[PDB]
């Protein structure tokens, strides 16, 4: 287990993916040319998980950039770290998906899919020991959503034994670019339930609420939302890219986090919450960092963790702090909040501490929870879907692509079963 192959699909996927690469390059001391200029051996110890070493001192992201639209790709190349990417790894179409899952999954996407697989095969065959794949995409669009899930299925076919991981961004009416987002999301959730091993549920509803309510940003931009996404992505991948004992690879993370195959949707959390401009800040102790685990205000999925129960939790502390203090504080939270952890999975909270804090902060905490409360996110999508589907509104955009009504009914039913499954384990007891 070594290399992770990263895929970026659609507008959102490429925007969030590009930010992930500039954040992690900065943490690993890599400049936009690919040269390491850091001053810590920890930065290079597990550099091979995300970077290929090219001739000389240069490091190249093992990243494939995908879109059915060319514009986003140009914006990435023009960017700060745009030059770091492998030129041959940009795979783009000319005919977009027009925020239509059917175009991304069946028409335009199907036409481009083989060109993408050719690039993923090149990266995969170069690997000493491929862990698997990491996909960043939105569920509300057409490319990220439809083509992204098509790619997952095509990759799963060729690499059935590798770990399939995603960072899936959930649509919200609060920051919506299309009226059909509930359809695109439901059709994609159906695909993810079946085809991924782990999915980080990144909710735009929660990101907007954090920016507006907590960061006091009257009109949040994608730039503001993406600052929270990149902080979360950096946090959840800490264990994979730095030397550590816990969840050091994609499979060990999945084995510790996924008790039942379909229940692989994670609720990420982050503390402290910061705004792009906020380079202040003077705060955050160990008890303070720990308290934000149950804090709904710090969740990247718009669910209250106190409305459910944690099946499994992974908590990552970053910065210079006492491991003794972390262990005490973490035990206190489990003992005080006993009722929000399932009794039939003993020692289900695993903690890791990394000496390297993320940029701008001296101390941070990242939470990865497998909570039954994630059903609130799926319920929200199902109700938005049904409001439209009941009247067959905008259905012509999908049937016009060759889709049948049954696929819509099936996707919805599968998502409602997922909700019902979370509820089942929420109500389960250690009567054993």
């Amino acid at each position: 287990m070594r290399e992770i192959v990263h895929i970026q699909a659609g507008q959102c996927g490429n925007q969030i993916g590009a930010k992930f690469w500039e954040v992690i390059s900065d943490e690993h001391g890599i400049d936009p040319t690919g040269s390491y200029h850091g001053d810590s051996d920890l930065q290079l110890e597990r550099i091979n998980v995300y970077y290929n070493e090219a001739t000389g001192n240069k490091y190249v992201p093992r990243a494939i950039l995908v879109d059915l639209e060319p514009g986003t790709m140009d914006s990435v190349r023009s960017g700060p770290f745009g030059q770091i990417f492998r030129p041959d790894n940009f795979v783009f179409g000319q005919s977009g998906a027009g925020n239509n899952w059917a175009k991304g999954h069946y028409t335009e996407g199907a036409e481009l899919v083989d060109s993408v697989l050719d690039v993923v095969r090149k990266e995969s065959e170069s690997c000493d020991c491929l862990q698997g794949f990491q996909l960043t995409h939105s569920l509300g669009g057409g490319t990220g959503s439809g083509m992204g899930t098509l790619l997952i299925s095509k990759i799963r076919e060729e690499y059935p034994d590798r770990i399939m991981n995603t960072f899936s961004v959930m649509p919200s009416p609060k920051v919506s670019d299309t009226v059909v987002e509930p359809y695109n999301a439901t059709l994609s959730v159906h695909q993810l339930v079946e085809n991924t091993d782990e999915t980080y549920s990144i909710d735009n509803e929660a990101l907007y609420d954090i920016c507006f309510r907590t960061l006091k940003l009257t009109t949040p931009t994608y730039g503001d939302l993406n600052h929270l996404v990149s902080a979360t992505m950096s946090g959840v991948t800490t264990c994979l890219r730095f030397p550590g004992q816990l969840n050091a690879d994609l499979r060990k993370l999945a084995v510790n986090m996924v008790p039942f195959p379909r229940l692989h949707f994670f609720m990420p959390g982050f503390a402290p919450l910061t705004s792009r401009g906020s380079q202040q800040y003077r705060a955050l102790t160990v008890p303070e960092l720990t308290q934000q685990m149950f804090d709904s205000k710090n969740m990247m999925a718009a669910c209250d963790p106190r409305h459910g129960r944690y099946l499994t939790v992974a908590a990552i502390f970053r910065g210079r702090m006492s491991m003794k203090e972390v262990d005490e504080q973490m035990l206190n939270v489990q003992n005080k909040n006993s009722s929000y952890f399932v009794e039939w999975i003993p020692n289900n909270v695993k903690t890791a501490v990394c000496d390297i804090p993320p940029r701008g902060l001296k101390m941070s905490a990242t939470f990865i929870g497998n909570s039954t409360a994630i059903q609130e996110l799926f319920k929200r999508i199902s109700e938005q879907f049904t409001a439209m589907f009941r009247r067959k509104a905008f259905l012509h955009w999908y049937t016009g692509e060759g889709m049948d009504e049954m696929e819509f009914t099936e996707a919805e039913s599968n998502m409602n079963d997922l909700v019902s499954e979370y509820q089942q384990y929420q109500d389960a007891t250690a009567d054993e």
């Binding site: 005919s95 977009g96 027009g98 059909v180 009109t219 009941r390 955009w397």
Partner: protein
């Protein structure tokens, strides 16, 4: 790359085309000879070996008079002669002559020219069709062309800019017949149609521009401004854009319910100088006033299904959201129960350009709202009633029958309009 072919049919279509292409040239800095001293303008203008920029457009009329003015006018060098197509005999305000008798002679030639323009496209998005409902060419030839375009172009996007008739400027008693016949025949062939009621435009020119007796020149300059607002997103690359497909996705919930209501603001007279500068809040408020509408109807008596706001010029997202929030506190704006996300906002950097010597004042910021409201059914009802008055007596029917049309075609067209009115009614009902 992402090309759009513009087709201008009959007097209304050709004359509006003249106004649109004059405005596009001013916006992109293209001279009347095609010379020019972004890059998105290439969706509407092709380029020759001599560095000249040529509109991706076809102008068609069954009579030569109107187009003869284009080929003698200021922009005679802008268009190549082959893209300006004229017959000899007009359709004489008769849909049957436009569609059958006269139209059948020029149809093959028009499609051959469109094919030559399409061959110069690497990523043809589709067509923009400009025509009147009332004239024999505007009605009859357009529906014939629309049918033929569906055959030759598979499922390629077709959007209309239709001139809804007004008695203040009407030239034929038979305009309601021509309007219903063209709407029935074109309905299954069009993806999205923007109606422009000549009375609404006539009243805006009178009220806002202080023109006692508005002429087609006055009407078209104002129309051109709304068309330019809808097409700016295709011809420019701004912070927020919308392509041929995204317009349809956001505004068209059902195939037949494809008629958005356009509302433009501000419309200021070239005099005064104190009546500006209007804020983003002020121009947004003006979109919800029935006086700024492009079609006469009452949205307060209807339900919204989609609202697209297209801003142009000195506009900031924070300003827009603040304006939309205050409008949301005015309870009076009702949406259908199956529609959550109501507002799609687009901002294009370029302030509205005005024709030198025109009636419009230069403004720092403008906005065009495209809303799909059930209130637009009121425009169909007015037309259908005028049709019924004459049709009950079979008045003027002999003119159509004489050209080979059957009375059954009139019944079919009217039944289809009754079904359309019924569709708008069904769509507004809650589940």
């Amino acid at each position: 790359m992402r090309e759009c072919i513009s087709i201008h049919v009959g007097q209304a279509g050709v004359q509006i085309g003249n106004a649109c292409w004059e405005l596009y040239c001013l916006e992109h800095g293209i001279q009347p000879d095609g010379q020019m001293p972004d890059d998105s303008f290439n969706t509407f203008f092709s380029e020759t070996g001599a560095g000249k920029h040529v509109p991706r457009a076809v102008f068609v009329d069954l009579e030569p008079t109107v187009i003869d003015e284009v080929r003698t006018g200021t922009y005679r060098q802008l268009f190549h002669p082959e893209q300006l197509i004229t017959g000899k005999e007009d359709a004489a305000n008769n849909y049957a002559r436009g569609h059958y008798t006269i139209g059948k002679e020029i149809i093959d030639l028009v499609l051959d020219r469109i094919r030559k323009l399409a061959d110069q496209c690497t990523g043809l998005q589709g067509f923009l069709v400009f025509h009147s409902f009332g004239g024999g060419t505007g009605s009859g030839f357009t529906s014939l062309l629309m049918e033929r375009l569906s055959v030759d172009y598979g499922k390629k996007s077709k959007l209309e800019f239709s001139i809804y008739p007004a008695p203040q400027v009407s030239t034929a008693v038979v305009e309601p017949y021509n309007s219903i016949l063209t709407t029935h025949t074109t309905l299954e062939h069009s993806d999205c149609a923007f109606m422009v009621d000549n009375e609404a435009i006539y009243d805006i020119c009178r009220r806002n521009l202080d023109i006692e007796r508005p002429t087609y020149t006055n009407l078209n300059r104002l129309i051109s401004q709304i068309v330019s607002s809808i097409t700016a997103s295709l011809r420019f690359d701004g912070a927020l854009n919308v392509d041929l497909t995204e317009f349809q996705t956001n505004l068209v919930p059902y195939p037949r319910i494809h008629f958005p209501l356009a509302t433009y603001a501000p419309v200021i007279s070239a005099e005064k100088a104190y009546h500006e500068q209007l804020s983003v809040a002020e121009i947004t408020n003006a979109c919800f006033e029935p006086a700024n509408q492009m079609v006469k109807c009452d949205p307060r008596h209807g339900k919204y299904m989609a609202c697209c706001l297209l801003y142009r010029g000195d506009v900031v997202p924070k300003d827009v959201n603040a304006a939309i929030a205050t409008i949301k506190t005015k309870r009076s704006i009702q949406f259908v129960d199956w529609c959550p996300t109501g507002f799609k906002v687009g901002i294009n950097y370029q302030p509205p350009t005005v024709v030198p010597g025109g009636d419009l004042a230069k403004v720092q910021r403008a906005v065009c709202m495209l809303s799909n409201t059930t209130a637009i059914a009121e425009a169909w009802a007015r037309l259908d009633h005028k049709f019924d008055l004459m049709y009950a007596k079979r008045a003027f029917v002999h003119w159509y029958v004489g050209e080979g049309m059957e009375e059954g075609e009139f019944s079919e067209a009217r039944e289809d309009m009754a079904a359309l009115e019924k569709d708008y009614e069904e769509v507004g009902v809650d589940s």
